[PDB]
């Protein structure tokens, strides 16, 4: 009833990398598992599948560059010699059959993905600026400027203000990312209550909290 990817990070071209799917609610001696990858703004590519017996197939292009091992309750994808082409979000997924325990009905269970970034650009933490008004509703903002690599989580009040939020796709200039988030609340809700945008950038263990103030 669940799978989860982990281990995605920034590497320099050449150094090996191991992603890890961790499972719960079923046994790997019963179920197949597979890895699928998706570079940003692009298609799903199937990497390879691993059988409950330990056997393995990989896509044609994957041979040589990937490898899939399994343990008790983990499935590992080893990327052997990353190139910048290998930058993507790596999902982990579970094939089943007509009900369960096969592959012909495709994937019924996915993780949320783990982003791998391959590059010889430095890790940079983001600078985060409030966007305040210094009428029915009132829009507020966060400018999350100049970081690398992706991803960067943006919440508002720790995720307790989730509606009326727009978080815009990041954009690359130089080797640096930039994104904005808006959140529209009732005039009555602010400045009455205190609102705060929270930005996480796991890549440099940054966590920041701008409060928005008039």
């Amino acid at each position: 009833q669940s799978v989860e990817e982990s281990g995605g990070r920034l590497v320099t071209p050449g150094t090996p990398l191991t992603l890890t799917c961790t499972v719960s609610g079923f046994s790997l001696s019963t179920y197949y598992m597979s890895w699928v990858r998706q570079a940003p703004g692009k298609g799903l590519e199937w990497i390879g599948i691993i059988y409950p017996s330990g056997s393995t197939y990989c896509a044609s292009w994957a041979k040589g560059r990937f490898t899939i091992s399994k343990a008790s309750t983990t499935v590992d994808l080893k990327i052997t010699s990353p190139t910048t082409e290998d930058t993507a979000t790596y999902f982990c997924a579970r094939p089943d059959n007509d009900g369960t325990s096969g592959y012909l009905s495709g994937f019924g269970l996915w993780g949320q993905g783990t982003l791998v970034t391959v590059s010889s650009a430095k890790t940079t933490p983001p600078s985060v600026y409030p966007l305040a008004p210094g009428n029915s509703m009132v829009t507020l903002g966060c400018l999350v400027k100049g970081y690398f690599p992706e991803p960067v989580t943006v919440t508002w009040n720790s995720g307790s203000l989730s509606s009326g939020v727009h978080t815009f796709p990041a954009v690359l200039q130089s080797d640096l990312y930039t994104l904005s988030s808006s959140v529209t609340v009732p005039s009555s809700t602010w400045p009455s209550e205190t609102v705060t945008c929270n930005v996480a950038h796991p890549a440099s263990s940054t966590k920041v909290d701008k409060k928005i103030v008039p």
Binding site: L104, S105, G106, W110, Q112, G113
Partner: peptide, 8 residues
Amino acid sequence: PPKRLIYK
């Protein structure tokens, strides 16, 4: 991630 709509 994707949701499975139709199989077979």
